[PDB]
Design a protein around this motif. Structure first.
Motif, short mmCIF file in Angstrom:
data_model
loop_
_atom_site.label_atom_id
_atom_site.label_comp_id
_atom_site.label_asym_id
_atom_site.label_seq_id
_atom_site.Cartn_x
_atom_site.Cartn_y
_atom_site.Cartn_z
N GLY A 1 49.03 13.71 80.72
CA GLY A 1 50.14 12.89 80.93
C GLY A 1 50.93 14.49 81.68
N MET A 2 52.18 13.16 81.62
CA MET A 2 53.57 13.80 81.77
C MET A 2 54.41 13.99 81.00
SD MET A 2 56.18 12.09 84.68
CE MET A 2 57.51 10.92 83.44
N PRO A 3 54.62 15.32 80.96
CA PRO A 3 55.77 15.07 78.95
C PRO A 3 57.07 14.91 79.20
CG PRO A 3 55.41 17.16 80.65
CD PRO A 3 54.75 16.48 81.07
N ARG A 4 57.52 13.50 79.15
CA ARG A 4 58.60 12.89 78.45
C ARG A 4 59.83 13.14 77.33
NH1 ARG A 4 55.46 8.58 80.92
NH2 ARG A 4 57.44 7.78 82.31
N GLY A 5 60.68 13.57 77.47
CA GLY A 5 62.06 14.00 76.20
C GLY A 5 62.97 14.06 76.51
N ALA A 6 63.89 13.14 75.67
CA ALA A 6 65.10 13.40 75.35
C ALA A 6 66.17 13.90 74.29
CB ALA A 6 66.04 11.75 75.25
#
Lengths: 6, 391, 391, 6
Positions: free
Chosen positions: A1-6
């Motif tokens: 998958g595509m890494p996502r973060g905040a």
């Protein structure tokens, strides 16, 4: 998958 | 004494011209409170901003060492301990944070007690120790009074939605945060302001609003000196460029790697971003993590194999993925990979179903493209592009 | 005196037990209000239910003639005149209604003035003299005080949504009606209650929740003696049976026809309902209106021609329909018909597009079936069934 | 079309 973060 | 005080004393003894430098750095605009902090225990700057900025200016390589020392010696009932709780959570310094938490929920200051219990719910939800339902119930029973914790009780849910691939509630919830109501703690207002910039950037990415996404991440970068937020800003900017500008996406991820040299977690995140980038562009992929059983990394193994028609190896990886539990967004990617391996339109329809459920308007461009390449009817594709899942 | 009183006195002279009967029919405990009403000009019953129930019991064949005389003779400032405005609107007696309206908006009683102005906005929106935006603005400027007009200002929007094929706002709006707040005028509360039963039956139909649809129409039938509401109850029950039970649908439409004999408009509605029914079941269709240029009737001409492979005639009719302006729900049906004539998948996708825009989950079963007959993938159909248009 | 009303 595509890494996502905040 | 605390290490930070010791170091500043020493350095001042060797060079007096430092205090003026620190004065402008700490926002103290008057070396007065600087003297007072050094000479008298328990002196705290009015804003945690001051000591943070000094540590970063004078001892940037020792920040954690010093701040863990300072924060865990503060009076838990103070405004400094509350500001330090946010400093610790923002930096993912889970040591400082969790100790401050178990101290604050026990103490007799009501403000610090409230911060402590709210951040405790955040950490428990983040570690999947409680469910979202139990977090919401607990937050309700707390009868939150401070504006800061009204804001953070929303922020913690947003973090949960983002990490579980449940994007549909986020836009409406983030609009309900009112940071302007925070007046006593400017460090917490400004840090929460960065948090909102980064979350907003992610929400815009998930809505496929790419220019707005980059705008909010730029605002985040301008607004902060916290590595954690800089990392996720470059990550999100780079992601927003995935389908259009290979070189600029790569440049943002490489910038992330360069600021991540000493942080294994952030480094791994940027390797994963480059891995996904190179699979999207069907390039040779030097970033794959072959020593991982996470869905993220295995999916990119399978994607790379599919790109190079190593279908047996791709099937072996998808076999491994079959024996792991997936969230809706992860499952959408799974069905995309299955569809490409099998050349099976029904898999792309399932992929689309789960992208709609997670409300991911960005990654859904992958199955749509595949369906279009396989000759899908134009009006139909338009329907799949524009219709939405009822949440 | 007025006709109803003249008639009741003469009938009393011939039969002296009537006062009792009229008492029980009118819900009164005894004939006191009857004598007051007969003997004194300008006397009004407590509840308008009383005089309506007597007229329907004793002079059913004269109901219009009598009530037009009675209502247009009432003091416009009274509660009975407000009750009569609702009685007239519910029955679509536009001649009684409009006179009561232009009289009430002029008078000096504030309640009647408010009823009159709101019902005026309903009539103007119903006749496409004002837009929904202008109706909403005017209603806002009225600063409505009475619970009755708070309810009716929502009901009139519901009627507008239903007649324009714009079904998505209806479910939320109808829940905001609170008739229990209506305490002074029980006739208006009970008639509005019937109104909500019928509208709710249509909402359930449009949501493809057929058992619920029929339940609400049965509640409507039980709660009323007004022909208009009985007509739309049998229409909606019959419609709910269109795709499943030809004989019972037909029986309900013919029941509606049987109580509608003397009303050209209602008779036409049941002819159109039976016409659509027979086209859905692809039967010989004796109900087609060949002397009409309405979209409703032309569509059923084309549908019948297509059913019987008269494709040239069907094409001539769809040609006529191309040169007419359609709302979304009408357009959805148009694309369904084109898709059947041309055996064209893209038309059925457009039909689905506009059924989703109108939020019609019932009639969308027609293009879905056709797509299924042409071999559309089952997962795709499931996806199209479950996704929605975002308004 | 299908007639509708309320």
């Amino acid at each position: 998958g595509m890494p996502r973060g905040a | 004494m605390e290490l930070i005080r010791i170091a500043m004393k020493k350095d001042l003894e060797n060079d007096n011209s430092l205090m003026n430098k620190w004065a402008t750095v700490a926002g103290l605009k008057n070396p007065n409170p600087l003297y007072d902090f050094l000479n008298h225990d328990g002196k705290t700057f009015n804003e945690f901003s001051s000591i943070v900025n000094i540590v970063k200016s004078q001892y940037p390589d020792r920040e954690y060492e010093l701040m863990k020392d300072y924060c865990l010696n503060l009076d838990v009932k103070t405004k400094a301990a509350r500001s330090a709780l946010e400093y610790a959570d923002a930096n993912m310094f889970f040591e400082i944070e969790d100790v401050l938490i178990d101290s604050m929920i026990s103490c007799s200051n009501m403000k610090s007690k409230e911060y402590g219990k709210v951040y405790k719910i955040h950490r428990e939800l983040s570690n999947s120790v409680i469910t979202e339902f139990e977090a919401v119930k607990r937050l309700g029973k707390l009868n939150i009074k401070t504006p800061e914790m009204n804001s953070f009780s929303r922020l913690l849910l947003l973090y949960h939605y983002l990490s579980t691939g449940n994007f549909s509630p986020m836009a409406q919830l983030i609009k309900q945060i009112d940071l302007s109501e925070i007046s006593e703690n400017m460090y917490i207002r400004n840090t929460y302001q960065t948090r909102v910039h980064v979350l907003m950037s992610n929400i815009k990415l998930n809505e496929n609003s790419l220019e707005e996404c980059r705008e909010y991440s730029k605002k985040a970068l301008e607004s902060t000196n916290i590595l954690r937020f800089q990392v996720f800003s470059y990550l999100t900017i780079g992601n927003s460029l995935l389908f259009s500008n290979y070189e600029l996406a790569q440049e943002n991820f490489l910038k992330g790697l360069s600021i991540s040299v000493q942080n294994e977690n952030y480094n791994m995140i940027f390797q994963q971003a480059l891995c996904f980038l190179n699979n999207v562009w069907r390039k040779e992929n030097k970033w794959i993590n072959f020593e991982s059983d996470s869905i993220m990394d295995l999916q990119e193994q399978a994607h790379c194999f599919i790109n190079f028609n190593e279908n047996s190896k791709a099937k072996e990886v998808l076999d491994k993925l079959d024996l792991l539990v997936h969230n809706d967004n992860e499952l959408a990617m799974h069905y995309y990979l299955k569809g490409r391996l099998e050349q099976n339109k029904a898999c792309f329809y399932s992929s689309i179903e789960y992208f709609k459920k997670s409300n991911d308007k960005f990654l859904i461009r992958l199955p749509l493209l595949e369906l279009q390449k396989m000759g899908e009817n134009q009006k139909l594709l338009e329907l799949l592009l524009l219709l939405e899942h009822h949440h």
